[PDB]
Design a binder for this molecule. Structure first.
Ligand SMILES: O=C1CC[C@H](Sc2ccccc2)C(=O)N1
Ligand SMILES: [Zn+2]
Length: 108
């Protein structure tokens, strides 16, 4: 009976990811970053996620991860901005960077 297995959208409960799917990019699953508007994000990298809606086409502009282009990832249910999908890179080609305080962790 693990209580810390699944990540859900904090705003609505949509199923998003799993602790088992955390990915240590450059040796750490956690990356703390700022956007050009100075907003700080505590980003957890995941190999896999579900329940999102990826908006638009990828952009390399101000990518926090060398070699990757990003797309905005909304909660597919409620539209909350949960993070970004990264693509176009190498080892791995793709991953998700999700904003940890916009998720809730809980049982399977
Ligand atoms: O890797 C990323 C994801 C998107 C954000 S936000 C951004 C806003 C305007 C232009 C370019 C990026 C960022 O800075 N870096
Ligand atoms: Zn949601």
């Amino acid at each position: 009976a693990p209580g810390a297995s699944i990540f859900r959208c904090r705003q609505c409960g949509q199923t998003i990811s799993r602790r088992d799917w955390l990915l240590p990019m450059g040796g750490d699953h956690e990356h703390v970053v700022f956007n050009p508007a100075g907003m700080i994000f505590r980003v957890w990298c995941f190999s896999l996620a579900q329940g999102l809606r990826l908006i638009g086409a990828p952009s390399g502009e101000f990518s926090w991860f060398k070699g990757y282009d990003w797309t905005i990832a909304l909660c597919g249910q409620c539209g909350s901005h949960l993070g970004w999908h990264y693509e176009g890179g190498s080892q791995p080609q793709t991953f998700f960077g999700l904003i940890k305080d916009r998720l809730a962790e809980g049982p399977a």
